[PDB]
Amino acid sequence: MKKYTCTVCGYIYNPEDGDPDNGVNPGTDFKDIPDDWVCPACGVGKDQFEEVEE
Ligand SMILES: [Fe+3]
């Protein structure tokens, strides 16, 4: 799956590690993360993230 980055602070969501402390298990693609999840480093919503294209 692809990584997504927060365009406000630079945090990168990597689907292989998820964000387990906030209920996103490793192996969850960004689209499936519940829509109320926010960036763990700056608090903005998923709407500020962009797919990291390879
Ligand atoms: Fe952020």
Curated annotation (Swiss-Prot):
Ranges for domain Rubredoxin-like come to: 1-54
Does the UniProt entry include the keyword 4Fe-4S? Answer: no
Q: Report the cofactors.
A: Fe(3+)
The PTM N-formylmethionine maps to M1
Does the keyword section mention Manganese? no
Matching InterPro entries, A to Z? Rubredoxin, Rubredoxin-like_dom, Rubredoxin_dom, Rubredoxin_ET, Rubredoxin_Fe_BS
Positions contributing to Fe cation binding: C6, C9, C39, C42
Give the family from UniProt: Belongs to the rubredoxin family.
Main function: Rubredoxin is a small nonheme, iron protein lacking acid-labile sulfide. Its single Fe, chelated to 4 Cys, functions as an electron acceptor and may also stabilize the conformation of the molecule.
Could you tell me what this protein is called?
Rubredoxin
